[PDB]
Every structure is written in structure tokens, then in C-alpha cells.
A paper describes a structure:
NleE, a virulence effector from EPEC, is a SAM-dependent methyltransferase that modifies a zinc-finger cysteine in TAB2/3 in the NF-κB pathway. We recently discovered that NleE is a SAM-dependent methyltransferase that modifies a cysteine in the NZF domains of TAB2/3, thereby disrupting ubiquitin-chain sensing of TAB2/3 and abolishing NF-κB-mediated proinflammatory responses. NleE-catalyzed cysteine methylation of TAB2/3 is the first example of enzyme-catalyzed protein cysteine methylation, representing a novel mechanism in regulating signal transduction in eukaryotes. NleE harbors no sequence homology to known methyltransferases.
Wild-type NleE yielded poor crystals, but NleE K181A protein, out of 15 Lys-to-Ala mutants designed to improve the crystallization, produced sufficient-quality crystals in the C2 space group. A model obtained from 2.6-Å diffraction data collected on the selenomethionine (Se-Met) protein was further refined and a final resolution of 2.3 Å was achieved. Despite the presence of four NleE in an asymmetric unit (chain A–D), NleE was exclusively a monomer in solution as judged by gel filtration chromatography analysis. The structure of NleE (residues 21–220: residues 1–20 and 220–224 lacked electron density) adopts α/β doubly wound topology with a central three-stranded anti-paralleled β-sheet (β1–β3) sandwiched by α-helices (α1–α10). β1–β3 are arranged in the left-right-middle order, which, together with the flanking α-helices (α8–α10), generates a deep and narrow cavity on the left side of NleE. The SAM molecule fits snugly into the cavity, which buries 2374 Å2 solvent accessible surface area, corresponding to 76% of the total surface area of SAM and leaving the rest of 24% exposing to the solvent. The interior of the SAM-binding cavity is filled with hydrophobic side chains, but polar interactions appear to play a key role in riveting the SAM into the cavity. Specifically, the α-carboxylic group of the amino acid moiety of the SAM is coordinated by the side chain of Arg107 situated on a loop connecting β1 and α6. The hydroxyl group of the ribose of the SAM is hydrogen-bonded with the side-chain carboxylic group of Glu191. The adenine ring of SAM is oriented by the aromatic ring of Tyr212 residing at α10 (residues 206–219) through a π-π stacking interaction. Remarkably, the overall architecture of NleE does not resemble any of the five families, thus representing a completely novel class of methyltransferases.
Numbering used by the authors: 21 to 52, 54 to 220
Amino acid sequence: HVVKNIYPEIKHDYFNESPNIYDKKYISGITRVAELKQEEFVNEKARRFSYMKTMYSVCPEAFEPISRNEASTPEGSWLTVISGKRPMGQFSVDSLYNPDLHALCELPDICCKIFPKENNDFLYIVVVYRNDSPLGEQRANRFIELYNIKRDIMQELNYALPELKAVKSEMIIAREMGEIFSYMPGEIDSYMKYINNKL
Ligand SMILES: C[S@@+](CC[C@H](N)C(=O)[O-])C[C@H]1O[C@@H](n2cnc3c(N)ncnc32)[C@H](O)[C@@H]1O
């Protein structure tokens, strides 16, 4: 149904478990044979979808850097992509029944790579990209590589050497992330200086 539709490769057991507290904002069932709420899911999704269709645009002949500020919320994270300002963004959802996530997946040439958040039981990462630009998938893939490097590093440090593991792992991949997220070169420098200070 609505979940396998946007997240084909999802674990089978997911639907055996019962709705967590976040799911319940949008559904009501014993398991994950639950009803979609008419107002909170169906009607919210349709409203958000209209909003997205209005803002939808095609990609420029070429992208310009956005400010990090335009993509610091989940909503701006995908808005900058659907309006064609940049080829990819990444955000999180506390429920695979998030109405925005479902609306996002119904836009032309808009793809979402979805997977469970590392070290979290309910959170999923969403990587949203322009399929109508060759940079879309490339950047989405490149993010997953950088993301895997970060989490591999942090897991290892967590295991054997935990001090400042998060900030250390940022020093390793943060500039590369900034670039693929299209942040302005100045904002990326400023972030590396913030990480450096954390030393
Ligand atoms: C936390 S992810 C958030 C992604 C955001 N929702 C998007 O779609 O662009 C942004 C990552 O980019 C890196 N980064 C580089 N420059 C940054 C900056 N100026 N502000 C925030 N993150 C920056 C950090 O590693 C950070 O984890």
C-alpha cells in the first residue's frame, strides 16, 4: 500500500509491529492493517500536495548555490529541490506515514531514497533528488557514501574511542556534504571553522 509504494525495499516485519506514537498522528490500527485518518493523513496529504504542485518547477540550465538557511528545516530541505533550486536535499521523518513524504513522491521527476536512521528506532532518513538532472541521483548516492562513512566512523569510535566522535566525523565529511547540498562556499567555510573550534 502507501508505504511499499514509496519505499519498496522495506523490511517485511515492519507491518507486523504496531503503530508507534508518531504513526498514530496519521493512522489507527492494531498492527501496521491500520486505517489512514481522513483529516490527518488523506486531507492533509492532499493539501500539502497542492502546495507542492504550485511550487514545483523544472531545473535550471545550471544550479546556483543556495544558502544553508533555505534548507535548515525539513520543509525547506525538499522545497529547494522541488522548486528546482538544487538537485538534492536530505531530511528526516518520525513516521513513514508523514503526509509531506507521500505528497513529495507524487511529483514528476522527484525521487526519494528512504532508510532507517542509524542509532534510532523510529526515525527514517529521506534523500530527495531531481531525476530530471543527472546530478540528482549522483548527489543522492554520494550522500549515502558520505553518510555511511560518518556512521562507520562514529560506530567505531563509539566502540573504542568515544571522545568528540561526532565532531571528529564531521571534520571528515562535512565539507563534502556542504558541497553536495549546494551550500554557499562561504557558509561551508564558516561551518568547518565551527567544527574546528569544537577541537
Ligand atoms: C545536517 S545535514 C542537513 C541537510 C539539509 N536538510 C539539506 O537538505 O540540505 C547538513 C550537513 O552538511 C554539512 N555542512 C556543511 N556546511 C554546513 C553548514 N554551513 N550548515 C549546516 N551543515 C553544513 C554538515 O555535515 C551537516 O551535517
